[PDB]
Design a protein around this motif. Sequence first.
Motif, PDB file in Angstrom:
ATOM      1  N   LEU A  13       0.872  -1.167   0.000  1.00 40.46           N
ATOM      2  CA  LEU A  13       0.000   0.000   0.000  1.00 40.46           C
ATOM      3  C   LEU A  13       0.916   1.226   0.000  1.00 40.46           C
ATOM      4  O   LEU A  13       1.821   1.297   0.835  1.00 40.46           O
ATOM      5  CB  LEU A  13      -0.886   0.043   1.261  1.00 40.46           C
ATOM      6  CG  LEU A  13      -1.514  -1.279   1.742  1.00 40.46           C
ATOM      7  CD1 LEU A  13      -2.285  -1.022   3.041  1.00 40.46           C
ATOM      8  CD2 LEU A  13      -2.449  -1.893   0.697  1.00 40.46           C
ATOM      9  N   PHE A  14       0.724   2.192  -0.900  1.00 39.19           N
ATOM     10  CA  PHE A  14       1.552   3.395  -0.925  1.00 39.19           C
ATOM     11  C   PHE A  14       0.799   4.537  -0.244  1.00 39.19           C
ATOM     12  O   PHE A  14      -0.356   4.810  -0.573  1.00 39.19           O
ATOM     13  CB  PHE A  14       1.942   3.730  -2.372  1.00 39.19           C
ATOM     14  CG  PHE A  14       3.065   4.735  -2.617  1.00 39.19           C
ATOM     15  CD1 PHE A  14       3.838   5.320  -1.589  1.00 39.19           C
ATOM     16  CD2 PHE A  14       3.369   5.066  -3.948  1.00 39.19           C
ATOM     17  CE1 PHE A  14       4.880   6.213  -1.886  1.00 39.19           C
ATOM     18  CE2 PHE A  14       4.398   5.969  -4.251  1.00 39.19           C
ATOM     19  CZ  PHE A  14       5.160   6.543  -3.221  1.00 39.19           C
ATOM     20  N   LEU A  15       1.460   5.224   0.692  1.00 32.92           N
ATOM     21  CA  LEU A  15       0.932   6.383   1.404  1.00 32.92           C
ATOM     22  C   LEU A  15       1.075   7.679   0.571  1.00 32.92           C
ATOM     23  O   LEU A  15       1.304   8.754   1.128  1.00 32.92           O
ATOM     24  CB  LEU A  15       1.652   6.471   2.767  1.00 32.92           C
ATOM     25  CG  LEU A  15       0.822   7.173   3.858  1.00 32.92           C
ATOM     26  CD1 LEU A  15      -0.285   6.248   4.387  1.00 32.92           C
ATOM     27  CD2 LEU A  15       1.730   7.571   5.028  1.00 32.92           C
ATOM     28  N   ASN A  16       1.010   7.599  -0.765  1.00 31.80           N
ATOM     29  CA  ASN A  16       1.202   8.727  -1.678  1.00 31.80           C
ATOM     30  C   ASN A  16       0.328   8.535  -2.912  1.00 31.80           C
ATOM     31  O   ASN A  16       0.253   7.419  -3.422  1.00 31.80           O
ATOM     32  CB  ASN A  16       2.657   8.775  -2.153  1.00 31.80           C
ATOM     33  CG  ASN A  16       2.871   9.962  -3.079  1.00 31.80           C
ATOM     34  OD1 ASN A  16       2.731   9.840  -4.289  1.00 31.80           O
ATOM     35  ND2 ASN A  16       3.129  11.141  -2.543  1.00 31.80           N
ATOM     36  N   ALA A  17      -0.280   9.606  -3.428  1.00 27.47           N
ATOM     37  CA  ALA A  17      -1.289   9.524  -4.482  1.00 27.47           C
ATOM     38  C   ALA A  17      -0.791   9.938  -5.878  1.00 27.47           C
ATOM     39  O   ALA A  17      -1.595   9.970  -6.813  1.00 27.47           O
ATOM     40  CB  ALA A  17      -2.507  10.358  -4.062  1.00 27.47           C
ATOM     41  N   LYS A  18       0.495  10.273  -6.051  1.00 33.90           N
ATOM     42  CA  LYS A  18       1.015  10.880  -7.283  1.00 33.90           C
ATOM     43  C   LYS A  18       2.162  10.047  -7.833  1.00 33.90           C
ATOM     44  O   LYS A  18       2.018   9.483  -8.919  1.00 33.90           O
ATOM     45  CB  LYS A  18       1.446  12.338  -7.022  1.00 33.90           C
ATOM     46  CG  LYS A  18       0.331  13.272  -6.511  1.00 33.90           C
ATOM     47  CD  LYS A  18      -0.853  13.481  -7.467  1.00 33.90           C
ATOM     48  CE  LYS A  18      -0.412  14.119  -8.791  1.00 33.90           C
ATOM     49  NZ  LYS A  18      -1.565  14.450  -9.665  1.00 33.90           N
ATOM     50  N   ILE A  55       4.377   1.826   2.103  1.00 34.91           N
ATOM     51  CA  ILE A  55       5.447   2.604   1.491  1.00 34.91           C
ATOM     52  C   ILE A  55       5.271   4.046   1.959  1.00 34.91           C
ATOM     53  O   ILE A  55       4.186   4.620   1.825  1.00 34.91           O
ATOM     54  CB  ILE A  55       5.420   2.464  -0.050  1.00 34.91           C
ATOM     55  CG1 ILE A  55       5.240   1.020  -0.562  1.00 34.91           C
ATOM     56  CG2 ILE A  55       6.662   3.103  -0.690  1.00 34.91           C
ATOM     57  CD1 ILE A  55       6.199  -0.032   0.001  1.00 34.91           C
ATOM     58  N   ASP A  56       6.334   4.604   2.535  1.00 29.67           N
ATOM     59  CA  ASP A  56       6.454   6.011   2.893  1.00 29.67           C
ATOM     60  C   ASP A  56       7.005   6.790   1.691  1.00 29.67           C
ATOM     61  O   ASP A  56       7.628   6.222   0.791  1.00 29.67           O
ATOM     62  CB  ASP A  56       7.418   6.161   4.085  1.00 29.67           C
ATOM     63  CG  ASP A  56       7.577   7.611   4.577  1.00 29.67           C
ATOM     64  OD1 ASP A  56       6.621   8.410   4.424  1.00 29.67           O
ATOM     65  OD2 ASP A  56       8.641   7.917   5.166  1.00 29.67           O
ATOM     66  N   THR A  88       7.274   1.604   7.595  1.00 32.38           N
ATOM     67  CA  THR A  88       6.822   2.293   6.396  1.00 32.38           C
ATOM     68  C   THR A  88       8.086   2.581   5.591  1.00 32.38           C
ATOM     69  O   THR A  88       8.884   3.442   5.972  1.00 32.38           O
ATOM     70  CB  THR A  88       6.041   3.554   6.793  1.00 32.38           C
ATOM     71  OG1 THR A  88       6.676   4.215   7.867  1.00 32.38           O
ATOM     72  CG2 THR A  88       4.630   3.197   7.234  1.00 32.38           C
ATOM     73  N   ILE A  89       8.344   1.793   4.546  1.00 32.93           N
ATOM     74  CA  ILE A  89       9.630   1.838   3.849  1.00 32.93           C
ATOM     75  C   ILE A  89       9.645   3.014   2.848  1.00 32.93           C
ATOM     76  O   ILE A  89       8.705   3.123   2.062  1.00 32.93           O
ATOM     77  CB  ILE A  89       9.952   0.471   3.192  1.00 32.93           C
ATOM     78  CG1 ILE A  89       8.811  -0.033   2.276  1.00 32.93           C
ATOM     79  CG2 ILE A  89      10.273  -0.578   4.279  1.00 32.93           C
ATOM     80  CD1 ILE A  89       8.988  -1.443   1.711  1.00 32.93           C
TER      81      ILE A  89
END
Length: 111
Positions: A13-18, A55-56, A88-89
């Motif tokens: 899961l990625f903590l970023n939308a772009k 993912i950070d 959170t890698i």
Amino acid sequence: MKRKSIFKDKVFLFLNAKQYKKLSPAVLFGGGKTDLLMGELKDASVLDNPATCVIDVAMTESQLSESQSTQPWITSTLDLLQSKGLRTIPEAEIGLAVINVSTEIYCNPRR
């Protein structure tokens, strides 16, 4: 030719939308799986299971020279995810591991 088993038997899961819109096809060429959600941690099974990650952003890029006003930060979500059960890698270490074909511990949230 480069490795095509970067995250072959892993999901994240990625903590970023772009950056997600390029990290997804990069990791798919890498053989692995990607999703974009920031509240799926509502239940900790996404951390307890042996092959999911979170993912950070490249927050590790923060310079000590101006850390008081630098935009990236060690937001509480990283520590909350640590409290649930996983790291959170940073996406930056994914880029390094993609460049070097070395997804060993660079991009491992559980170690």
